[PDB]
Amino acid sequence: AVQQNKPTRSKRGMRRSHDALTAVTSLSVDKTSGEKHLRHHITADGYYRGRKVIAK
Amino acid sequence: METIAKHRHARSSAQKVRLVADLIRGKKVSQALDILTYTNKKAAVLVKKVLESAIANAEHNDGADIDDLKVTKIFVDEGPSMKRIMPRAKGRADRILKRTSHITVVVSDR
Amino acid sequence: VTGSGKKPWRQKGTGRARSGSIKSPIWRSGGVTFAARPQDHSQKVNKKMYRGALKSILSELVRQDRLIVVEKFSVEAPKTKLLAQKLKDMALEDVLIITGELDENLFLAARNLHKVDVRDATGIDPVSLIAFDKVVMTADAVKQVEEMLA
Amino acid sequence: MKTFTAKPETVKRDWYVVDATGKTLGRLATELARRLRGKHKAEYTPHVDTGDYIIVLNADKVAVTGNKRTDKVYYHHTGHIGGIKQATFEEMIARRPERVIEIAVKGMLPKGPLGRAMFRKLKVYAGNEHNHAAQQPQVL
Amino acid sequence: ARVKRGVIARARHKKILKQAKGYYGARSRVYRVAFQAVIKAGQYAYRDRRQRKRQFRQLWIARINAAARQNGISYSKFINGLKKASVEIDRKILADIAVFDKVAFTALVEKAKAALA
RNA sequence: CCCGGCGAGGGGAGUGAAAAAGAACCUGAAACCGUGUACGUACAAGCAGUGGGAGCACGCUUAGGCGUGUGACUGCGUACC
RNA sequence: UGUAACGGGGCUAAACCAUGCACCGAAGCUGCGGCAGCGACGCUUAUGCGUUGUUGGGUAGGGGAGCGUUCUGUAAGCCUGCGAAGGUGUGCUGUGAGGCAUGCUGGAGGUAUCAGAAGUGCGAAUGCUGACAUAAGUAACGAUAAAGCGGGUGAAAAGCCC
Numbered sequence: 001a002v003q004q005n006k007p008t009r010s011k012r013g014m015r016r017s018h019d020a021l022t023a024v025t026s027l028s029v030d031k032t033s034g035e036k037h038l039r040h041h042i043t044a045d046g047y048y049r050g051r052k053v054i055a056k
Numbered sequence: 057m058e059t060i061a062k063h064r065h066a067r068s069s070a071q072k073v074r075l076v077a078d079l080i081r082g083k084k085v086s087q088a089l090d091i092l093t094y095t096n097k098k099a100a101v102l103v104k105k106v107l108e109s110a111i112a113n114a115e116h117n118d119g120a121d122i123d124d125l126k127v128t129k130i131f132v133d134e135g136p137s138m139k140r141i142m143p144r145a146k147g148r149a150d151r152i153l154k155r156t157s158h159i160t161v162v163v164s165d166r
Numbered sequence: 167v168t169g170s171g172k173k174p175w176r177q178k179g180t181g182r183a184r185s186g187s188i189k190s191p192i193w194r195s196g197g198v199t200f201a202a203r204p205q206d207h208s209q210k211v212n213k214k215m216y217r218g219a220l221k222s223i224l225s226e227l228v229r230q231d232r233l234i235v236v237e238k239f240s241v242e243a244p245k246t247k248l249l250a251q252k253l254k255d256m257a258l259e260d261v262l263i264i265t266g267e268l269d270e271n272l273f274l275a276a277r278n279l280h281k282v283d284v285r286d287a288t289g290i291d292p293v294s295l296i297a298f299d300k301v302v303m304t305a306d307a308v309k310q311v312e313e314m315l316a
Numbered sequence: 317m318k319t320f321t322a323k324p325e326t327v328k329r330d331w332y333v334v335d336a337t338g339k340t341l342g343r344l345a346t347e348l349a350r351r352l353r354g355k356h357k358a359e360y361t362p363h364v365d366t367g368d369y370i371i372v373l374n375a376d377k378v379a380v381t382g383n384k385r386t387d388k389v390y391y392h393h394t395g396h397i398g399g400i401k402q403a404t405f406e407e408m409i410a411r412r413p414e415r416v417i418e419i420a421v422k423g424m425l426p427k428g429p430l431g432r433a434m435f436r437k438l439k440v441y442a443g444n445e446h447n448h449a450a451q452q453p454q455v456l
Numbered sequence: 457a458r459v460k461r462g463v464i465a466r467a468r469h470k471k472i473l474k475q476a477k478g479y480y481g482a483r484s485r486v487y488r489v490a491f492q493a494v495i496k497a498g499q500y501a502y503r504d505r506r507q508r509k510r511q512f513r514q515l516w517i518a519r520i521n522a523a524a525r526q527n528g529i530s531y532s533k534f535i536n537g538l539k540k541a542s543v544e545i546d547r548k549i550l551a552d553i554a555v556f557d558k559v560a561f562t563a564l565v566e567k568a569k570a571a572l573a
Numbered sequence: 574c575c576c577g578g579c580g581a582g583g584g585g586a587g588u589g590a591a592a593a594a595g596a597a598c599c600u601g602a603a604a605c606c607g608u609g610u611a612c613g614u615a616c617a618a619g620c621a622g623u624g625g626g627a628g629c630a631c632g633c634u635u636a637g638g639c640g641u642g643u644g645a646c647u648g649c650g651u652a653c654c
Numbered sequence: 655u656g657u658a659a660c661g662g663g664g665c666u667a668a669a670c671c672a673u674g675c676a677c678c679g680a681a682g683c684u685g686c687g688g689c690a691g692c693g694a695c696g697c698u699u700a701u702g703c704g705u706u707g708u709u710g711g712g713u714a715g716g717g718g719a720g721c722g723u724u725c726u727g728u729a730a731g732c733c734u735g736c737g738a739a740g741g742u743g744u745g746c747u748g749u750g751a752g753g754c755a756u757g758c759u760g761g762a763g764g765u766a767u768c769a770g771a772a773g774u775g776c777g778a779a780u781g782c783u784g785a786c787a788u789a790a791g792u793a794a795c796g797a798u799a800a801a802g803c804g805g806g807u808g809a810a811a812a813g814c815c816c
Contacts, residue, residue: 002789038090058584105578112575112577116574117574129607322627323627324485358522389657426662430647445664481623507680535676543686
């Protein structure tokens with residue numbers, strides 16, 4: 001049926017509680033002193049130190 | 057205040073764009089990218105590239121410390137106005153919006 | 167107006183409407199809703215509204231106003247820049263430049279700054295008597311009975 | 317230059333050991349409320365926001381004197397109007413201090429206003445000189 | 457004659473009125489309190505200065521029963537005693553001196569005790 | 574001049590009296606919103622109140638009863654036409 | 655379909671009746687201000703100030719009166735770039751539309767006199783012109799039926815391509 005009821009104020013537009021983010025930490029580790037992710041060594045070429053998948 | 061490089065205009069609504077601003081208040085300028093690039097949304101990536109535009113300027117433009125500029129508020133505004141159509145009833149509804157956004161970063165110092 | 171009568175469509179099958187008339191005098195691109203009548207009417211002053219104790223202001227003011235000197239001859243007239251001195255014998259320099267006279271003479275440069283349409287020649291026009299300070303009447307004995315209009 | 321008594325929170329709580337238990341109870345259970353508001357402590361805020369602490373002593377001796385005490389049901393049916401029903405009478409329920417036959421304030425601040433936070437302040441234990449579960453500074 | 461609605465329509469609603477809340481969105485802050493409903497709030501004060509006073513009456517006259525009832529001197533039955541004297545009538549408030557004058561107020565019962573009691 | 578995406582937007586410069594005149598050009602409020610100074614505050618009823626006032630972010634006073642609003646207590650009541 | 659006849663709670667007398675008697679106690683008549691009508695007085699008198707009588711809820715009707723966004727006038731007349739003025743809130747002023755002011759602003763404008771009357775003093779025409787605060791993360795997301803790498807280029811390819 002048609003929307004014959006109240007606007008999105010307080011009790012609705014308030015609802016943010018469990019819609020939240022995941023507050024991720026991260027390791028500085030200069031083995032990859034730029035292109036690294038959270039603890040995930042490189043977001044692309046799959047390097048660690050020498051020859052692995054397609055790195056070096 | 058110091059620096060305010062907001063970006064225009066996105067495709068998203070201000071609701072999805074606003075969902076992340078609070079995280080970066082006060083205590084995250086030193087290492088800002090990790091929470092934003094590893095939460096890889098067209099909101100967080102936008103607040104990333106905002107922050108980046110704002111603070112790559114600040115250290116040059118004033119002479120301040122790039123590590124003491126405390127990223128103090130980050131709010132958003134819409135607008136002006138944009139429309140498009142999809143003829144679902146072709147005499148009534150039919151009329152999708154872009155409310156759009158521009159991220160009023162406001163960075164400041166400790 | 168040009169605006170399309172009378173009526174476009176029947177007004178059922180939605181469950182929300184009011185109107186559809188296009189015009190109607192109310193809505194948009196129209197108009198003067200009160201029949202458009204040229205109100206052409208000359209509000210009629212009667213014969214003895216002029217006769218008519220009409221001149222009697224010079225009995226209320228009676229001191230500074232009706233200013234009884236002489237006839238409209240004494241100006242150049244190629245230099246009304248000189249007039250305010252030829253106006254020191256009725257004292258008022260340029261205040262309100264009239265005389266309530268008759269004969270055709272060159273005084274009518276007296277409206278040059280806006281003032282009044284002067285009107286002069288016998289039919290002084292009642293709206294000159296209400297409510298200026300120098301309601302000037304100047305001239306000699308043509309004031310008797312019906313002449314009081316002057 | 318005002319005559320009223322805000323807050324007062326709470327000035328007068330009158331630490332009295334209710335020797336009235338059973339013996340004349342139905343003459344002063346009816347007045348526990350006009351006590352916790354008044355008749356001595358009426359001197360302060362005799363209608364609003366205050367607190368109170370009598371020193372309770374026993375429960376199941378409600379006395380109450382009349383044909384009431386042996387067919388007067390107590391109901392609650394706390395859920396979906398209860399369906400299946402409860403009927404233990406006033407001397408057979410009073411065998412526990414519970415929620416409706418022991419407090420008297422349930423009958424006397426009846427909607428909940430004035431009463432909405434100071435519910436257990438009277439302790440709601442029972443047990444005499446075997447178990448004084450109340451105040452250590454001197455009672456009355 | 458051109459109207460275009462002005463000058464007075466907001467003056468009769470807020471201007472100098474020290475009040476910041478006010479009936480929220482659709483019953484007010486849109487516009488709809490402005491003309492015909494603004495009376496309502498102050499109208500709880502239209503009588504009740506005379507009607508709420510009962511609530512506080514018991515507070516004054518407590519210091520003329522709270523200690524006297526023990527000594528038996530119950531305020532309304534002691535008043536059919538008092539009001540035998542055509543000089544004493546205005547006990548209704550001014551007797552409030554009893555909650556701090558105690559140690560000398562405590563003899564005002566002795567006055568006529570061998571007749572009044 | 575500087576910054577990013579050989580981009581958007583800003584932060585100063587500056588023609589300018591002005592950029593709250595900046596080429597989504599109108600010297601400019603209305604439906605709704607983002608972050609903050611203080612609240613009441615995740616045991617809620619009853620047009621969300623004006624009261625009656627306790628003390629709170631704050632701003633006066635050689636003390637001197639206040640210039641401020643969410644509105645603990647709860648009183649009154651059903652604003653329509 | 656929760657015991658649901660004082661509103662509760664059933665009070666062995668607090669009660670029921672009978673005799674006394676003091677407080678509570680709508681707006682209800684009193685303190686005491688203020689005063690629109692219709693009358694009566696002291697006297698005044700263009701007419702009015704207070705005394706005294708009746709008495710002050712007011713959509714159908716006749717009586718009788720207040721002010722404005724400004725047009726048509728008071729008016730080379732006094733006022734303004736030394737600011738003429740809103741949305742507003744320092745302070746009260748009237749019986750009232752509201753203001754004479756003023757506070758903080760705008761950035762150009764007025765009637766403290768009376769004369770003038772009609773585009774005529776909005777929130778309720780199931781609104782109306784352009785709408786959207788609105789149903790939430792609003793398709794069945796476009797039948798549910800396709801996949802797989804190894805690479806290549808590059809500002810960015812599940813698609814372009816071998």
